[PDB]
């Protein structure tokens, strides 16, 4: 089966540069005409660049908003595609996809003058107002971080059922916040420990936050 | 320069047949391809070279192309087919690739679900850091439209409010969240704060008070 894995996305400031990589497996990469395609939040897909097969001359083509700033290239020996991005603009913020009929998972490019900021993690304690029908809701607030993404697990990933991690809000500040809630039996609250484990890889930060009844 | 035209929306009833069109000048000379993109996931091809079905794609998805229109037909539509569908084709000289605008497909008569609303007051650790956030979480509703209003006592508050767009969840339902940022002094000064969530003529108002 086919898989494409993009890497290299992250936060960079306007004017900056980045290099995106894509590892291809499962088809004859030597013959493939490969493209980059990007998707800004809530927008449609926007083709970025294409490179033909080496046997067809390896010709590069660019979308007009990126022509002259970006460079697409390929390395047949390693089944690699590359996109070198320069003079980046805030409008280039998007998920970048490597594609040749099949699609990778994408890699997030954030163009912003704002600096990287790890989260402030606060507990959302279960109370009686978050208790109904024998189950209680408790969670963590992951406040004021940048860039995306943040991922949350519970009790080091031993509690995977009944977990609801919400899409992040993008605030007026430019910063993101998100919440993760787990629903648990009410009678376990006195005896079971609950810890949310926040991972913010862009700031190399992990936070384990104990959530205790109020 | 070259553009592929695709209807922004198509809506159908479960089990009947959806047709998504994609119109372009170069389609007589270039292949079109069709992609399904599910909420939060990467596109997956469903039609290759006008009319070929990729392996594993269900039989109900089929494409055809003649003249300046390529068409994706979904027979016996299911709720699970709700997604955005894109066509792709190169220009007449096959120098650059072009995407359609996308077509959001909505399956009608999906059951209405009243939202679960949970409201958290500011944590004590956050208050000691001299901040205050009320967290109003809104889950498992359909259709995907809610309005959030915040109140301090009985008075509406607009400042400090941050509310997400609803996003389609796993079960094709929606979730959203709303955040009211206050100073600890504003938190303590009022008798209560309220998150009021309206959905299809139903209103739910959760209330929290600084003394509880």
């Amino acid at each position: 089966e086919v898989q494409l894995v993009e890497s290299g996305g992250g936060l960079v400031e306007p004017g900056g540069s980045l290099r995106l990589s894509c590892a291809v497996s499962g088809f004859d990469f030597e013959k493939a005409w490969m493209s980059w395609v990007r998707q800004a939040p809530g927008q449609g897909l926007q083709w970025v660049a294409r490179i033909k097969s080496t046997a067809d001359g390896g010709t590069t083509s660019y979308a007009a908003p990126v022509e002259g700033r970006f460079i697409i290239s390929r390395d047949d020996s390693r089944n690699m595609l590359y996109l070198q991005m320069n003079s980046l603009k805030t409008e280039d913020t998007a998920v970048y996809y490597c594609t040749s009929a099949h699609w990778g998972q994408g890699t997030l490019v954030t163009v912003s003058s704002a600096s990287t900021k790890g989260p402030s993690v606060f507990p959302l304690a279960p109370s009686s107002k978050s208790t109904s029908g024998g189950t209680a809701a408790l969670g963590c607030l992951v406040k004021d971080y940048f860039p995306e993404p943040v991922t949350v697990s519970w009790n080091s990933g031993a509690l995977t059922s009944g977990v609801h991690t919400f899409p992040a809000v993008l605030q007026s500040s430019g910063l993101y916040s998100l919440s993760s809630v787990v629903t648990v039996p009410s009678s376990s609250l006195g005896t079971q420990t609950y810890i949310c484990n926040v991972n913010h890889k862009p700031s190399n930060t992990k936070v384990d936050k104990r959530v205790e009844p109020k | 320069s070259y553009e592929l035209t695709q209807p922004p929306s198509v809506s159908v009833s479960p089990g009947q047949t959806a047709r998504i069109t994609c119109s372009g000048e170069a389609l007589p000379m270039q292949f079109a391809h069709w992609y399904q993109q599910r909420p939060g996931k990467a596109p997956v091809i469903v039609v290759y070279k006008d009319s070929e079905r990729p392996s594993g794609v269900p039989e109900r998805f089929s494409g055809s192309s003649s003249g300046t229109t390529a068409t994706l037909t979904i027979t016996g539509v299911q709720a699970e087919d709700e997604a955005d569908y894109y066509c792709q084709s190169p220009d007449s000289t096959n120098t650059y690739e072009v995407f359609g605008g996308g077509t959001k497909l909505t399956v009608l008569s999906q059951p209405k679900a009243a939202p679960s609303v949970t409201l958290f007051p500011p944590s004590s650790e956050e208050l000691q850091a001299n901040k205050a956030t009320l967290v109003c979480l809104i889950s498992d509703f359909y259709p995907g439209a809610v309005t959030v209003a915040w109140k301090a006592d009985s008075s509406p508050v607009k400042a400090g409010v941050e509310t997400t767009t609803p996003s389609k969840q796993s079960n094709n339902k929606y979730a959203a969240s709303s955040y009211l940022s206050l100073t600890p002094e504003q938190w303590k000064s009022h008798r209560s704060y309220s998150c009021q969530v309206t959905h299809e003529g139903s209103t739910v108002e959760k209330t929290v008070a600084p003394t509880e």
Binding site: V2, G26, F27, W33, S100, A101 | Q30, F31, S55, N94
Partner: peptide, 10 residues
């Protein structure tokens, strides 16, 4: 395995 873009035209 054989579904990728090969630069083919009609």
């Amino acid at each position: 395995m054989d579904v990728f873009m090969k630069g083919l035209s009609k």
